[PDB]
Amino acid sequence: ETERTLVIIKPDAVVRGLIGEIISRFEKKGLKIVGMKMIWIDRELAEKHYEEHREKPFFKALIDYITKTPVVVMVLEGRYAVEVVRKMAGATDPKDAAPGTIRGDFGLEVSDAICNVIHASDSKESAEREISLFFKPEELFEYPRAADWFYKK
Amino acid sequence: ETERTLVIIKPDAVVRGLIGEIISRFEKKGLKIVGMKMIWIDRELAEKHYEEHREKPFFKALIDYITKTPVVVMVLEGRYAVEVVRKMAGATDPKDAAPGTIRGDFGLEVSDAICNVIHASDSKESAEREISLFFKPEELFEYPRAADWFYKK
Amino acid sequence: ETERTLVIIKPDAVVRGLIGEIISRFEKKGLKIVGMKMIWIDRELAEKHYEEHREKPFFKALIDYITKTPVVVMVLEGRYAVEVVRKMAGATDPKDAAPGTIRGDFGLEVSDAICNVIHASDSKESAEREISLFFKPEELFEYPRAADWFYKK
Amino acid sequence: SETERTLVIIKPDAVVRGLIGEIISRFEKKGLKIVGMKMIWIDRELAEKHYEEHREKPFFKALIDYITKTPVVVMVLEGRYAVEVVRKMAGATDPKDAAPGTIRGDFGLEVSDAICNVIHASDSKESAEREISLFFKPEELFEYPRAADWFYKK
Amino acid sequence: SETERTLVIIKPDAVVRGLIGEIISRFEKKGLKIVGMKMIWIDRELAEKHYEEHREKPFFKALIDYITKTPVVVMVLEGRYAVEVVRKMAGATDPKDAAPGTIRGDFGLEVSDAICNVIHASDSKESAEREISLFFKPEELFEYPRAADWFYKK
Amino acid sequence: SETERTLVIIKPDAVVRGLIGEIISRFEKKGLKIVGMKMIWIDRELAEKHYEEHREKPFFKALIDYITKTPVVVMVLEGRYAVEVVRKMAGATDPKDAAPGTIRGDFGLEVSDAICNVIHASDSKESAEREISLFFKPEELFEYPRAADWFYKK
Ligand SMILES: [Cl-]
Ligand SMILES: [Cl-]
Ligand SMILES: [Cl-]
Ligand SMILES: [Cl-]
Ligand SMILES: [Cl-]
Ligand SMILES: [Cl-]
Ligand SMILES: [Cl-]
Ligand SMILES: [Cl-]
Ligand SMILES: [Cl-]
Ligand SMILES: [Cl-]
Ligand SMILES: [Cl-]
Ligand SMILES: [Cl-]
């Protein structure tokens, strides 16, 4: 049941100083950070990440948005991490996101792109692809978090 | 899409020392406080604010409640602020409010009135009316919040 | 409308140092702690508490889980406390629990038992039974919380 | 008695950064009572009056520009030895020197031509009385019970 | 070894104000282990025994009234130099003097006939041993692993 | 100018305990800017280089074991007098002595053969320059605006 998912703390979150608060929500949930780094995504890498949206009217604005400032890419590991993180993120448009979710508590304002604080892989398949896009095997780790032993049988 | 809505931090919240926590939820969401003040509402003003409930059995208790102690009236500005703040507030009766919402996390106990921490305009029309009831143009401001520039195109 | 419900801060929560955070959610909601103590449940007491699950395949793992380390048993009092606390707890399996709920924000990983941070009585009847299992009348108290007077008529 | 009233100004840097709520919560959690509060946009005349004791100082200009840059939140806090207490809670004037745990220590650092320091707190009972008058009319100050007031009755 | 056990009492003012959880979280976050805990309503005899060293002091009466006003939460914290550490975390006896960041500094201020100060923390290992015995039976104290215990093995 | 860059290492004890976010938030809330950051697993050679000034000290071995026990998060913080400020925020080297409000004061206590103290913070501008180079390539450090940067323009 243990999976890995990719999360991008977007430019709006970085600029607003919400990196720590976002990471804490994942740590408190029990999710493990197995990879993480601040990078500045260029257009080529951004378009590969968002290839599925190439023919949508908001594509250019989305690329402008994700490459606006540095972001923090990180890999989260844990039981059904993909669906769980998607649930924690909330509705794509923050105004529709439920209070308690990341977008629900932190997002609202938008530009020509729907600024929504973070990105979260939509599936195990997508996570695998996205993780490979931003990380090399040497940047991903296997280690114990404090409470890991508790769940072992 | 930018709208203004009126919020009243009710007597139960003021007495319990929750003013700051409530305001923080709005600031963290990205909403801008364009007007705010602590006042003590008298019955005449209270009945005007709650005119729609004049013929309901709980009217008197509601007026007693909202005028029990000073309250904090404030105007919030932001993308679809009206519906967003209503969503953040949660169900009218706090016991039915979802965890994560203001009433869901802070409210429960009631008197002869359904004490529910805050008031939030139910529509743009109502917000306009309510704002005019408590504020003069000189008490409302237009200024930049830190991240405003980020969403400009 | 005032009821009492039994809550058990389970071994996973105790080991992870979440006792305070869980208690705070109840206090902030307006619920009153009328009884509380850290104990180490033995198998006999555990099986009585979870008698309803005796013939389910996960029974043994559940008993192992609840008796793994000391736990904190506490009685919460307040308007419709039973249903309210159940709502605050969230879905039985933490991965399905909504952000904002206790299990939604704190739970995820499991062992051979569905580790889910806390236990909450499912009904007034069950609460009465469970409370009697862990507490004597001398361990339950009637006293005023700061804001009690506010709701009196 | 020991009960005093002090004036706090949540300055433009705090308002802009969205820190109004966090600052207010610190005072509420301490047990201090908010007896008056409002968001206003201070004009040069009022700013100069509030900081009249510094009119003959080099940083005066930058200070006035700073305090009038955007709206602020002025408030009156009431409680046991409130003046000295809120001052202690505020921390050292220059936030870089303020201790972790204080408002300036946790929230302040960067400066402009003025030493941006999150909030203003009356320096003494005499200053508190003077400042409260500059920003509040008696009609805007209230006497009401906070939840735990009854607990401390002597 | 350096591992000690100290007694903490979350006093009536904290219980009434709904601060039990916030106080406990501070100790948990520090790495201290709760080896015993329960809500009790202290009677005059027990209160006087706990504060016997102050029986010959003016404020004794108000103190007993205060500590027995409502139920309290007594707990035993275990950890490296726990006694001095919890004392440091508590802050100055009179909360108005306690530094921001400490429990009394962030949560205490108002007083009654007694100097209400949120919690009690054993003053020394000798006092800790005596106080733990007054409130807890060995059967109510436990030895178990906290999540990160394994990380510090020497 | 007064703007400096310092190196912070969120040590294995903090990573294991799930405190990465809380630590980062303290720096963000202070107004400090994260110009570089990444999770890495320090090897003995790099650990020894970082702590070369302590290679001739008894606790050296335990220190290397500690800092390389699990992955860590290294980051560069930029801001007004960042070096001294982050040091102040960190608190006393031995967490038992660190004041409540500081990172070590609120989160640290227990130790192994090494004095586990949550994070590392450069001791001076000279050490900061040296340490930043050991962990980061110029290509991993960025220049960008944080939300309120415009507010402080002189
Ligand atoms: Cl949602
Ligand atoms: Cl963990
Ligand atoms: Cl709701
Ligand atoms: Cl902002
Ligand atoms: Cl749920
Ligand atoms: Cl209360
Ligand atoms: Cl200071
Ligand atoms: Cl109060
Ligand atoms: Cl102190
Ligand atoms: Cl732990
Ligand atoms: Cl220190
Ligand atoms: Cl910023």
PDB file of N, CA, C and O in Angstrom, chain F residues 3-63:
ATOM      1  N   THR F   3      22.593  42.682   4.534  1.00  0.00           N
ATOM      2  CA  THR F   3      22.066  41.400   4.076  1.00  0.00           C
ATOM      3  C   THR F   3      23.150  40.329   4.041  1.00  0.00           C
ATOM      4  O   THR F   3      24.186  40.499   3.399  1.00  0.00           O
ATOM      5  N   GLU F   4      22.899  39.223   4.731  1.00  0.00           N
ATOM      6  CA  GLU F   4      23.854  38.127   4.793  1.00  0.00           C
ATOM      7  C   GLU F   4      23.173  36.801   4.470  1.00  0.00           C
ATOM      8  O   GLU F   4      21.946  36.722   4.382  1.00  0.00           O
ATOM      9  N   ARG F   5      23.987  35.766   4.285  1.00  0.00           N
ATOM     10  CA  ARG F   5      23.491  34.422   4.011  1.00  0.00           C
ATOM     11  C   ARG F   5      24.124  33.478   5.022  1.00  0.00           C
ATOM     12  O   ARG F   5      25.336  33.522   5.252  1.00  0.00           O
ATOM     13  N   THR F   6      23.314  32.630   5.637  1.00  0.00           N
ATOM     14  CA  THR F   6      23.844  31.685   6.604  1.00  0.00           C
ATOM     15  C   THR F   6      23.373  30.284   6.248  1.00  0.00           C
ATOM     16  O   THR F   6      22.377  30.112   5.536  1.00  0.00           O
ATOM     17  N   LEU F   7      24.099  29.280   6.730  1.00  0.00           N
ATOM     18  CA  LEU F   7      23.756  27.893   6.450  1.00  0.00           C
ATOM     19  C   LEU F   7      23.084  27.247   7.651  1.00  0.00           C
ATOM     20  O   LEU F   7      23.565  27.357   8.778  1.00  0.00           O
ATOM     21  N   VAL F   8      21.964  26.581   7.396  1.00  0.00           N
ATOM     22  CA  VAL F   8      21.232  25.879   8.439  1.00  0.00           C
ATOM     23  C   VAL F   8      21.117  24.412   8.052  1.00  0.00           C
ATOM     24  O   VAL F   8      20.857  24.084   6.895  1.00  0.00           O
ATOM     25  N   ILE F   9      21.339  23.528   9.015  1.00  0.00           N
ATOM     26  CA  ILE F   9      21.179  22.114   8.751  1.00  0.00           C
ATOM     27  C   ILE F   9      20.105  21.624   9.705  1.00  0.00           C
ATOM     28  O   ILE F   9      20.233  21.789  10.920  1.00  0.00           O
ATOM     29  N   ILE F  10      19.034  21.066   9.157  1.00  0.00           N
ATOM     30  CA  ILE F  10      17.986  20.492   9.983  1.00  0.00           C
ATOM     31  C   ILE F  10      18.508  19.071  10.173  1.00  0.00           C
ATOM     32  O   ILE F  10      18.439  18.232   9.272  1.00  0.00           O
ATOM     33  N   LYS F  11      19.069  18.832  11.355  1.00  0.00           N
ATOM     34  CA  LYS F  11      19.688  17.557  11.699  1.00  0.00           C
ATOM     35  C   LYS F  11      18.781  16.331  11.744  1.00  0.00           C
ATOM     36  O   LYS F  11      17.557  16.442  11.791  1.00  0.00           O
ATOM     37  N   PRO F  12      19.384  15.129  11.734  1.00  0.00           N
ATOM     38  CA  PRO F  12      18.628  13.874  11.764  1.00  0.00           C
ATOM     39  C   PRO F  12      17.559  13.750  12.843  1.00  0.00           C
ATOM     40  O   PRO F  12      16.501  13.174  12.592  1.00  0.00           O
ATOM     41  N   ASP F  13      17.817  14.268  14.043  1.00  0.00           N
ATOM     42  CA  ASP F  13      16.804  14.171  15.085  1.00  0.00           C
ATOM     43  C   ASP F  13      15.534  14.926  14.695  1.00  0.00           C
ATOM     44  O   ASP F  13      14.426  14.442  14.927  1.00  0.00           O
ATOM     45  N   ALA F  14      15.694  16.091  14.074  1.00  0.00           N
ATOM     46  CA  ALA F  14      14.541  16.880  13.645  1.00  0.00           C
ATOM     47  C   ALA F  14      13.823  16.206  12.477  1.00  0.00           C
ATOM     48  O   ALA F  14      12.594  16.184  12.429  1.00  0.00           O
ATOM     49  N   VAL F  15      14.589  15.659  11.536  1.00  0.00           N
ATOM     50  CA  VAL F  15      13.988  14.983  10.390  1.00  0.00           C
ATOM     51  C   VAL F  15      13.185  13.777  10.865  1.00  0.00           C
ATOM     52  O   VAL F  15      12.028  13.592  10.486  1.00  0.00           O
ATOM     53  N   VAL F  16      13.798  12.964  11.716  1.00  0.00           N
ATOM     54  CA  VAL F  16      13.141  11.778  12.236  1.00  0.00           C
ATOM     55  C   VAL F  16      11.857  12.104  13.008  1.00  0.00           C
ATOM     56  O   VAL F  16      10.851  11.410  12.874  1.00  0.00           O
ATOM     57  N   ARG F  17      11.889  13.173  13.795  1.00  0.00           N
ATOM     58  CA  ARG F  17      10.732  13.566  14.591  1.00  0.00           C
ATOM     59  C   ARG F  17       9.654  14.329  13.818  1.00  0.00           C
ATOM     60  O   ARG F  17       8.627  14.705  14.387  1.00  0.00           O
ATOM     61  N   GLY F  18       9.884  14.555  12.528  1.00  0.00           N
ATOM     62  CA  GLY F  18       8.904  15.262  11.716  1.00  0.00           C
ATOM     63  C   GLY F  18       8.789  16.746  12.016  1.00  0.00           C
ATOM     64  O   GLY F  18       7.690  17.309  11.983  1.00  0.00           O
ATOM     65  N   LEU F  19       9.922  17.389  12.274  1.00  0.00           N
ATOM     66  CA  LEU F  19       9.935  18.812  12.603  1.00  0.00           C
ATOM     67  C   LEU F  19      10.454  19.738  11.509  1.00  0.00           C
ATOM     68  O   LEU F  19      10.660  20.928  11.761  1.00  0.00           O
ATOM     69  N   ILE F  20      10.674  19.212  10.308  1.00  0.00           N
ATOM     70  CA  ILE F  20      11.193  20.039   9.218  1.00  0.00           C
ATOM     71  C   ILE F  20      10.343  21.277   8.961  1.00  0.00           C
ATOM     72  O   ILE F  20      10.857  22.394   8.923  1.00  0.00           O
ATOM     73  N   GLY F  21       9.043  21.073   8.780  1.00  0.00           N
ATOM     74  CA  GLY F  21       8.155  22.189   8.502  1.00  0.00           C
ATOM     75  C   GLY F  21       8.099  23.265   9.568  1.00  0.00           C
ATOM     76  O   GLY F  21       8.119  24.458   9.259  1.00  0.00           O
ATOM     77  N   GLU F  22       8.017  22.851  10.828  1.00  0.00           N
ATOM     78  CA  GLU F  22       7.942  23.802  11.927  1.00  0.00           C
ATOM     79  C   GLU F  22       9.186  24.671  12.007  1.00  0.00           C
ATOM     80  O   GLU F  22       9.097  25.867  12.295  1.00  0.00           O
ATOM     81  N   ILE F  23      10.344  24.077  11.738  1.00  0.00           N
ATOM     82  CA  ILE F  23      11.596  24.821  11.773  1.00  0.00           C
ATOM     83  C   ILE F  23      11.636  25.825  10.628  1.00  0.00           C
ATOM     84  O   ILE F  23      11.936  27.002  10.835  1.00  0.00           O
ATOM     85  N   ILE F  24      11.311  25.368   9.423  1.00  0.00           N
ATOM     86  CA  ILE F  24      11.312  26.254   8.270  1.00  0.00           C
ATOM     87  C   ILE F  24      10.346  27.422   8.479  1.00  0.00           C
ATOM     88  O   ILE F  24      10.680  28.561   8.180  1.00  0.00           O
ATOM     89  N   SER F  25       9.160  27.141   9.013  1.00  0.00           N
ATOM     90  CA  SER F  25       8.172  28.197   9.245  1.00  0.00           C
ATOM     91  C   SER F  25       8.687  29.300  10.160  1.00  0.00           C
ATOM     92  O   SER F  25       8.323  30.466  10.005  1.00  0.00           O
ATOM     93  N   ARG F  26       9.522  28.943  11.128  1.00  0.00           N
ATOM     94  CA  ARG F  26      10.050  29.955  12.028  1.00  0.00           C
ATOM     95  C   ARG F  26      10.898  30.963  11.272  1.00  0.00           C
ATOM     96  O   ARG F  26      10.827  32.165  11.532  1.00  0.00           O
ATOM     97  N   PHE F  27      11.697  30.470  10.332  1.00  0.00           N
ATOM     98  CA  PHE F  27      12.544  31.348   9.544  1.00  0.00           C
ATOM     99  C   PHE F  27      11.705  32.175   8.570  1.00  0.00           C
ATOM    100  O   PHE F  27      11.946  33.370   8.400  1.00  0.00           O
ATOM    101  N   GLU F  28      10.708  31.551   7.946  1.00  0.00           N
ATOM    102  CA  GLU F  28       9.852  32.278   7.013  1.00  0.00           C
ATOM    103  C   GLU F  28       9.078  33.386   7.722  1.00  0.00           C
ATOM    104  O   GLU F  28       8.974  34.497   7.213  1.00  0.00           O
ATOM    105  N   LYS F  29       8.548  33.078   8.902  1.00  0.00           N
ATOM    106  CA  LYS F  29       7.772  34.043   9.678  1.00  0.00           C
ATOM    107  C   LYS F  29       8.616  35.219  10.168  1.00  0.00           C
ATOM    108  O   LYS F  29       8.102  36.318  10.361  1.00  0.00           O
ATOM    109  N   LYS F  30       9.912  34.985  10.356  1.00  0.00           N
ATOM    110  CA  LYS F  30      10.838  36.022  10.814  1.00  0.00           C
ATOM    111  C   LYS F  30      11.096  37.017   9.687  1.00  0.00           C
ATOM    112  O   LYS F  30      11.443  38.175   9.928  1.00  0.00           O
ATOM    113  N   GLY F  31      10.924  36.556   8.453  1.00  0.00           N
ATOM    114  CA  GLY F  31      11.156  37.416   7.306  1.00  0.00           C
ATOM    115  C   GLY F  31      12.384  36.982   6.528  1.00  0.00           C
ATOM    116  O   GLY F  31      12.756  37.610   5.534  1.00  0.00           O
ATOM    117  N   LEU F  32      13.028  35.915   6.991  1.00  0.00           N
ATOM    118  CA  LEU F  32      14.212  35.387   6.319  1.00  0.00           C
ATOM    119  C   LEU F  32      13.790  34.699   5.026  1.00  0.00           C
ATOM    120  O   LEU F  32      12.715  34.110   4.951  1.00  0.00           O
ATOM    121  N   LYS F  33      14.648  34.777   4.014  1.00  0.00           N
ATOM    122  CA  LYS F  33      14.373  34.188   2.710  1.00  0.00           C
ATOM    123  C   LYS F  33      15.173  32.917   2.472  1.00  0.00           C
ATOM    124  O   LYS F  33      16.380  32.883   2.714  1.00  0.00           O
ATOM    125  N   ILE F  34      14.499  31.869   2.007  1.00  0.00           N
ATOM    126  CA  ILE F  34      15.177  30.612   1.703  1.00  0.00           C
ATOM    127  C   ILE F  34      15.682  30.724   0.266  1.00  0.00           C
ATOM    128  O   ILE F  34      14.896  30.693  -0.679  1.00  0.00           O
ATOM    129  N   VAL F  35      16.992  30.861   0.097  1.00  0.00           N
ATOM    130  CA  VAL F  35      17.547  30.993  -1.242  1.00  0.00           C
ATOM    131  C   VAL F  35      18.104  29.684  -1.786  1.00  0.00           C
ATOM    132  O   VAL F  35      18.488  29.600  -2.952  1.00  0.00           O
ATOM    133  N   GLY F  36      18.135  28.663  -0.935  1.00  0.00           N
ATOM    134  CA  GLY F  36      18.615  27.355  -1.337  1.00  0.00           C
ATOM    135  C   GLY F  36      18.188  26.311  -0.326  1.00  0.00           C
ATOM    136  O   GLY F  36      18.162  26.590   0.873  1.00  0.00           O
ATOM    137  N   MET F  37      17.852  25.115  -0.796  1.00  0.00           N
ATOM    138  CA  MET F  37      17.429  24.050   0.107  1.00  0.00           C
ATOM    139  C   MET F  37      17.308  22.688  -0.563  1.00  0.00           C
ATOM    140  O   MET F  37      16.885  22.574  -1.714  1.00  0.00           O
ATOM    141  N   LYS F  38      17.680  21.648   0.174  1.00  0.00           N
ATOM    142  CA  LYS F  38      17.601  20.293  -0.345  1.00  0.00           C
ATOM    143  C   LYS F  38      17.827  19.263   0.750  1.00  0.00           C
ATOM    144  O   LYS F  38      18.509  19.534   1.741  1.00  0.00           O
ATOM    145  N   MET F  39      17.231  18.090   0.569  1.00  0.00           N
ATOM    146  CA  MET F  39      17.413  16.993   1.503  1.00  0.00           C
ATOM    147  C   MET F  39      18.545  16.155   0.920  1.00  0.00           C
ATOM    148  O   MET F  39      18.509  15.774  -0.254  1.00  0.00           O
ATOM    149  N   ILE F  40      19.554  15.893   1.741  1.00  0.00           N
ATOM    150  CA  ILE F  40      20.701  15.092   1.335  1.00  0.00           C
ATOM    151  C   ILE F  40      21.046  14.150   2.477  1.00  0.00           C
ATOM    152  O   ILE F  40      20.551  14.310   3.592  1.00  0.00           O
ATOM    153  N   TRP F  41      21.876  13.153   2.199  1.00  0.00           N
ATOM    154  CA  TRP F  41      22.308  12.241   3.245  1.00  0.00           C
ATOM    155  C   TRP F  41      23.813  12.449   3.297  1.00  0.00           C
ATOM    156  O   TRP F  41      24.546  11.988   2.420  1.00  0.00           O
ATOM    157  N   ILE F  42      24.262  13.174   4.316  1.00  0.00           N
ATOM    158  CA  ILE F  42      25.675  13.486   4.483  1.00  0.00           C
ATOM    159  C   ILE F  42      26.523  12.246   4.743  1.00  0.00           C
ATOM    160  O   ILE F  42      26.165  11.394   5.556  1.00  0.00           O
ATOM    161  N   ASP F  43      27.645  12.155   4.032  1.00  0.00           N
ATOM    162  CA  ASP F  43      28.566  11.038   4.188  1.00  0.00           C
ATOM    163  C   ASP F  43      29.645  11.456   5.181  1.00  0.00           C
ATOM    164  O   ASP F  43      29.791  12.638   5.491  1.00  0.00           O
ATOM    165  N   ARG F  44      30.408  10.487   5.669  1.00  0.00           N
ATOM    166  CA  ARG F  44      31.458  10.765   6.638  1.00  0.00           C
ATOM    167  C   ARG F  44      32.465  11.826   6.181  1.00  0.00           C
ATOM    168  O   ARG F  44      32.830  12.705   6.956  1.00  0.00           O
ATOM    169  N   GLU F  45      32.914  11.753   4.930  1.00  0.00           N
ATOM    170  CA  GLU F  45      33.883  12.726   4.421  1.00  0.00           C
ATOM    171  C   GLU F  45      33.342  14.152   4.496  1.00  0.00           C
ATOM    172  O   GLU F  45      34.031  15.062   4.959  1.00  0.00           O
ATOM    173  N   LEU F  46      32.107  14.347   4.037  1.00  0.00           N
ATOM    174  CA  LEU F  46      31.496  15.673   4.058  1.00  0.00           C
ATOM    175  C   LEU F  46      31.224  16.123   5.492  1.00  0.00           C
ATOM    176  O   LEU F  46      31.424  17.292   5.834  1.00  0.00           O
ATOM    177  N   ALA F  47      30.772  15.196   6.328  1.00  0.00           N
ATOM    178  CA  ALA F  47      30.489  15.513   7.725  1.00  0.00           C
ATOM    179  C   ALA F  47      31.767  15.977   8.412  1.00  0.00           C
ATOM    180  O   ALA F  47      31.770  16.974   9.133  1.00  0.00           O
ATOM    181  N   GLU F  48      32.858  15.254   8.180  1.00  0.00           N
ATOM    182  CA  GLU F  48      34.138  15.609   8.784  1.00  0.00           C
ATOM    183  C   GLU F  48      34.667  16.950   8.288  1.00  0.00           C
ATOM    184  O   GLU F  48      35.334  17.672   9.027  1.00  0.00           O
ATOM    185  N   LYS F  49      34.374  17.282   7.035  1.00  0.00           N
ATOM    186  CA  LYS F  49      34.828  18.544   6.470  1.00  0.00           C
ATOM    187  C   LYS F  49      34.053  19.697   7.107  1.00  0.00           C
ATOM    188  O   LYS F  49      34.628  20.722   7.478  1.00  0.00           O
ATOM    189  N   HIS F  50      32.742  19.518   7.230  1.00  0.00           N
ATOM    190  CA  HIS F  50      31.875  20.527   7.825  1.00  0.00           C
ATOM    191  C   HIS F  50      32.303  20.810   9.264  1.00  0.00           C
ATOM    192  O   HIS F  50      32.341  21.963   9.697  1.00  0.00           O
ATOM    193  N   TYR F  51      32.626  19.750   9.995  1.00  0.00           N
ATOM    194  CA  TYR F  51      33.043  19.870  11.390  1.00  0.00           C
ATOM    195  C   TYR F  51      34.548  19.686  11.562  1.00  0.00           C
ATOM    196  O   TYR F  51      34.996  19.143  12.571  1.00  0.00           O
ATOM    197  N   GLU F  52      35.325  20.143  10.585  1.00  0.00           N
ATOM    198  CA  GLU F  52      36.778  19.998  10.646  1.00  0.00           C
ATOM    199  C   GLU F  52      37.393  20.671  11.870  1.00  0.00           C
ATOM    200  O   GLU F  52      38.367  20.173  12.433  1.00  0.00           O
ATOM    201  N   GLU F  53      36.821  21.801  12.282  1.00  0.00           N
ATOM    202  CA  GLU F  53      37.337  22.537  13.432  1.00  0.00           C
ATOM    203  C   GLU F  53      37.185  21.771  14.742  1.00  0.00           C
ATOM    204  O   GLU F  53      37.696  22.197  15.779  1.00  0.00           O
ATOM    205  N   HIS F  54      36.489  20.640  14.695  1.00  0.00           N
ATOM    206  CA  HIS F  54      36.277  19.829  15.890  1.00  0.00           C
ATOM    207  C   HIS F  54      36.908  18.448  15.760  1.00  0.00           C
ATOM    208  O   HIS F  54      36.708  17.588  16.616  1.00  0.00           O
ATOM    209  N   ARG F  55      37.673  18.237  14.693  1.00  0.00           N
ATOM    210  CA  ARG F  55      38.312  16.946  14.464  1.00  0.00           C
ATOM    211  C   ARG F  55      39.271  16.562  15.585  1.00  0.00           C
ATOM    212  O   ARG F  55      39.544  15.382  15.803  1.00  0.00           O
ATOM    213  N   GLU F  56      39.779  17.563  16.298  1.00  0.00           N
ATOM    214  CA  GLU F  56      40.705  17.320  17.396  1.00  0.00           C
ATOM    215  C   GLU F  56      39.992  17.421  18.741  1.00  0.00           C
ATOM    216  O   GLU F  56      40.551  17.927  19.716  1.00  0.00           O
ATOM    217  N   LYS F  57      38.755  16.933  18.783  1.00  0.00           N
ATOM    218  CA  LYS F  57      37.953  16.957  20.001  1.00  0.00           C
ATOM    219  C   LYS F  57      37.312  15.590  20.254  1.00  0.00           C
ATOM    220  O   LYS F  57      36.897  14.906  19.321  1.00  0.00           O
ATOM    221  N   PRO F  58      37.226  15.181  21.530  1.00  0.00           N
ATOM    222  CA  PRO F  58      36.656  13.907  21.987  1.00  0.00           C
ATOM    223  C   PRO F  58      35.310  13.499  21.387  1.00  0.00           C
ATOM    224  O   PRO F  58      35.131  12.357  20.965  1.00  0.00           O
ATOM    225  N   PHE F  59      34.366  14.433  21.360  1.00  0.00           N
ATOM    226  CA  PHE F  59      33.025  14.170  20.844  1.00  0.00           C
ATOM    227  C   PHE F  59      32.916  14.114  19.321  1.00  0.00           C
ATOM    228  O   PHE F  59      31.821  13.934  18.785  1.00  0.00           O
ATOM    229  N   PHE F  60      34.041  14.259  18.628  1.00  0.00           N
ATOM    230  CA  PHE F  60      34.042  14.247  17.167  1.00  0.00           C
ATOM    231  C   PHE F  60      33.361  13.026  16.550  1.00  0.00           C
ATOM    232  O   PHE F  60      32.505  13.164  15.676  1.00  0.00           O
ATOM    233  N   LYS F  61      33.745  11.834  17.000  1.00  0.00           N
ATOM    234  CA  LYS F  61      33.172  10.598  16.475  1.00  0.00           C
ATOM    235  C   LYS F  61      31.651  10.541  16.596  1.00  0.00           C
ATOM    236  O   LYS F  61      30.955  10.263  15.620  1.00  0.00           O
ATOM    237  N   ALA F  62      31.144  10.789  17.800  1.00  0.00           N
ATOM    238  CA  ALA F  62      29.706  10.760  18.047  1.00  0.00           C
ATOM    239  C   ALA F  62      28.993  11.789  17.180  1.00  0.00           C
ATOM    240  O   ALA F  62      27.877  11.558  16.711  1.00  0.00           O
ATOM    241  N   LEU F  63      29.651  12.924  16.975  1.00  0.00           N
ATOM    242  CA  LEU F  63      29.106  14.008  16.170  1.00  0.00           C
ATOM    243  C   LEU F  63      28.922  13.585  14.717  1.00  0.00           C
ATOM    244  O   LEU F  63      27.885  13.851  14.112  1.00  0.00           O
TER     245      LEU F  63
END
